[PDB]
């Protein structure tokens, strides 16, 4: 006697004005590697975009060209370890997001959806991210 | 006074959302009846969803079939205690009922020709019993009831049926021998609701939970059967409890008879397919009352399996693994979960288990509840019943496999068809008393604030353990009377009940106390009907009266036989009454309907010898 849309409306109207609590979710749900890698793919994507936007804003607002700021950092005569740590920290989120992005595109084709394959592809992304970030930072 | 009471008005109210309640519900809405559906569970949680083997119909997809052969197998399977007019209607309407379900989207398994797959099932034959095993059990692998109930629920979303989910029906609203509706309890908010209607349909399932071990769900407490009892109305043939042969050992979960229908065999401790000795022709596909007795005899005679010699083996590993995965994927998973068994390697430990109640609310072939007054069948005005809660009686003393799911959709539709031809929508709904059903609310509040000596869980176990030992596969008057004295004492000790949850919103402590009241009303009529019936017919097997007593002796020629009077033979229905206050059980008897709906189209089968 009630349509689906009407049932959904009464649900929210009944519950939101009630004294009923909301069952816990994120604080009690057990994590997994695919789930941790899903939200990490989101955090890396957002961090990369904000990094691009801070760069574009710097090109419009800073009084010096890019070669000037590279010359300033080079004149600081930093150690190869700090240069490596900086390079690794810059290229790690990009590399992870790229490999896990290819993993997402494979999923969008409908491939690799068996749960054991989800775990396999995730671990492969993890070791490919490390190997790529280690080789790139070494350059 | 203390409980807020809400009143409703409908053309008809259906109590139950199983396969039978749903078919009647939107069938009434199909016919323009403003219909309400009251169910204590969400519809797809009903025990129908657990059904596995399939549903019978003479479609003829595997071989040339004939619904009259299905009629014959059902009459013979019932041990001539079933009403042949109802069996006629069910077996003739079976092809249309299954075709309707498939047309609803039911994902039946398919044959090479694209038609509905049908497997063999216990006690079904061709050529009126002289043509060998039949294959008319239409199935969805071994998840037929799951797909049946989900298909019916989906179909019911198209109609204007007003659902009341998780409402617990307390009693009927009776006035001057007529049913005005039902009074129920809303579990979500704790309010009492009186539903007024010109016609009430009762499809509340069985009461298999009266026993300790049973394949039934925890919600199969015979709630509708007790409402009819509290209304001063009779129940029929309640002492005939079907014991399924292959209920898994331990958890009691069902292992489908389709296992034997696909080629599975039963094995004792010495590796013998012992059914070749009890039923040389039918073997493991004999009737369920025969197999359950055969397996029970092998156990007590010392040929049981396991470390306690208390069960037997169902062997499937001789069947190809591709067949096991296609035809029986459900029990493959279940045998692993509840027994650690790999069906491709080891057999399943099985033993007889309470499964189905042949008895229930007596109706006719139209679905109308009847009472017996001075030898005539009085139709109760406005009261209907269908499914396992009702006694058509299409199953008599023993039900054939895959016939209940048929009973549900045939007589669910029949109730809606009978109401449509007898009454019209929008007719003035009958009035009730201002305090109608207040005895239900008083009994509800009494149990809610119980403060006695015995808790509800402790009382339910004393009932289940009493039924399990005193009303098992074999029964004796000395043992049945001991169980009758125990049950009649447990019922009088319900005054000393003890509940804890003093709330009303989702008070499962209170609801399961009401279900105990309903279980006890059904359990008394069962063990007292079994004690009085001094014969062996179908499932009810008395070892002190091993014979079947009909009005004649159909093992000898009827030439000049002295006909036994109705008071001396036993081919008759048991009608049980219960004084709810004291608990005393009263028993009456009404004759079996041997006539069909058309003798020239379906010959009435006279009682004969019953062997497999």
């Amino acid at each position: 006697a009630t349509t689906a849309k009407e049932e959904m409306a009464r649900f929210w109207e009944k519950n939101t004005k009630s004294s009923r609590p909301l069952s816990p979710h994120i604080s009690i749900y057990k994590w997994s590697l695919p789930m941790a890698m899903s939200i990490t793919h989101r955090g890396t994507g957002v961090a990369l975009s904000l990094g691009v936007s801070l760069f574009s804003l710097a090109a419009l607002l800073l009084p010096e060209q890019f070669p000037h700021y590279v010359a300033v950092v080079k004149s600081l005569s930093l150690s190869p370890a700090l240069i490596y740590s900086a390079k690794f920290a810059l290229v790690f989120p990009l590399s992870y997001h790229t490999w896990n992005g290819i993993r997402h595109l494979v999923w969008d084709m409908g491939k690799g959806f068996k749960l054991s394959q989800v775990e396999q592809s995730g671990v492969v992304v993890l070791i490919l991210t490390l190997l790529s970030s280690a080789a790139i930072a070494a350059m | 006074t203390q409980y807020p009471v809400v009143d409703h008005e409908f053309d008809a109210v259906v109590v139950g959302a199983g396969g039978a309640g749903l078919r009647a519900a939107f069938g009434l809405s199909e016919a323009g009846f403003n219909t309400a559906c009251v169910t204590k569970l969400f519809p797809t949680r009903s025990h129908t969803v657990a059904a596995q083997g399939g549903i019978n119909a003479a479609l003829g997809n595997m071989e040339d079939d004939n619904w009259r052969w299905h009629f014959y197998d059902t009459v013979k399977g019932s041990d001539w205690l079933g009403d042949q007019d109802a069996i006629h209607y069910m077996t003739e309407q079976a092809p249309a009922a299954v075709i309707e379900l498939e047309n609803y989207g039911m994902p039946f398994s398919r044959t090479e020709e694209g038609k509905i797959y049908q497997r063999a099932f216990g006690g079904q034959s061709l050529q009126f019993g002289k043509g060998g095993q039949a294959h008319r059990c239409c199935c969805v692998a071994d998840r037929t009831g799951h797909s049946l109930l989900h298909t019916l629920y989906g179909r019911s979303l198209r109609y204007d049926t007003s659902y009341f989910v998780e409402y617990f029906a307390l009693d009927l609203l009776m006035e001057n021998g007529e049913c005005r509706g039902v009074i129920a309890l809303c579990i979500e908010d704790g309010t009492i609701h009186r539903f007024r209607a010109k016609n009430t349909v009762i499809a509340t399932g069985g009461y298999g939970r009266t026993y300790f071990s049973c394949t039934s769900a925890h919600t199969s407490t015979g709630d509708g059967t007790a409402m009819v009892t509290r209304a001063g109305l009779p129940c029929q043939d309640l002492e005939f409890v079907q014991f399924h042969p292959t209920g898994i050992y331990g958890a009691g979960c069902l292992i489908t008879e389709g296992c034997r229908g696909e080629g599975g065999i039963l094995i004792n401790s010495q590796g013998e397919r012992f059914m070749e000795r009890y039923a040389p022709v039918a073997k493991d596909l004999a009737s369920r009352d025969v197999v359950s007795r055969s397996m029970t005899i092998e156990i007590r005679e010392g040929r049981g399996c396991g470390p306690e010699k208390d069960h037997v083996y169902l062997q499937l590993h001789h069947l190809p693994p591709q067949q096991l995965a296609t035809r029986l994927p459900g029990i493959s998973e279940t045998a692993m979960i509840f027994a650690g068994v790999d069906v491709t390697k080891e057999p399943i430990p099985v033993l007889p288990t309470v499964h189905y109640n042949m008895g229930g609310i007596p109706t006719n072939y139209k679905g109308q509840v009847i009472t017996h007054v001075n030898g005539e069948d009085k139709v109760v005005p406005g009261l209907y019943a269908c499914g396992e809660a009702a006694s058509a009686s299409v199953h008599g003393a023993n039900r054939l496999g895959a016939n209940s799911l048929l009973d549900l959709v045939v007589f669910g539709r029949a109730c809606a068809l009978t109401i449509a031809e007898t009454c019209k929508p929008g007719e003035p709904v009958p009035s009730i008393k201002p305090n109608a059903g207040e005895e239900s609310v008083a009994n509800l509040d009494k149990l809610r604030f119980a403060d006695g000596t015995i808790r509800t869980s402790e009382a339910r176990l004393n009932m289940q353990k009493t039924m399990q030992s005193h009303a098992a596969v074999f029964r004796t008057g000395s043992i049945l009377q001991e169980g009758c004295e125990k049950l009649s004492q447990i019922y009088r000790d319900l005054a000393h009940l003890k509940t804890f949850d003093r709330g009303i919103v989702w008070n499962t402590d209170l609801v399961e106390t009401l279900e105990l009241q309903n279980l006890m009303l059904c359990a008394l009529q069962t063990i007292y009907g079994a004690e009085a019936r001094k014969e062996s017919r179908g499932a009810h097997a008395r070892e002190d009266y091993k014979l079947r007593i009909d009005e004649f002796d159909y093992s000898k020629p009827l030439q000049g036989q002295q006909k036994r009077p109705f008071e001396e033979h036993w081919r008759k229905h048991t009608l049980s009454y219960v004084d709810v206050k004291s608990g005393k059980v009263t028993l009456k008897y009404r004759p079996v309907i041997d006539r069909t709906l058309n003798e020239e189209d379906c010959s009435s089968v006279p009682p004969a010898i019953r062997s497999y």
Partner: protein, 102 residues
């Protein structure tokens, strides 16, 4: 368009495949063609990406409107600053190389 949601889902995947191919393009063929293609792809992919985060996490008529407008300002400024860097400065490809020569 009655298929606007599915056409957008396809475009998101298409731009990701395009952006994926620009990484070997930037390493193998650095120059203005890849700098500006990177500028357009990094902005469009990031804009659609941050929109999904807003759709998932921001609720209410006004907060959704405020977030999507503020995101549109961020994207437009980002694409313009990237084009400014490509035309007036060394460009994306050369900036990455100079940064890695440190």
């Amino acid at each position: 368009s009655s298929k606007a949601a599915s056409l957008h889902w396809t475009s998101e995947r298409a731009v990701s495949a395009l952006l994926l191919g620009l990484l070997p393009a930037a390493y193998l063929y650095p120059g203005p063609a890849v700098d500006y293609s990177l500028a357009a792809a990094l902005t469009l992919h990031g804009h659609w990406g941050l929109g999904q985060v807003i759709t998932d996490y921001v609720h209410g008529d006004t907060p959704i409107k405020v977030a999507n407008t503020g995101l549109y300002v961020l994207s437009a400024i980002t694409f313009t600053g990237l084009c400014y860097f490509n035309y007036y400065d060394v460009g994306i490809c050369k900036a990455v190389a100079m940064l890695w020569s440190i």
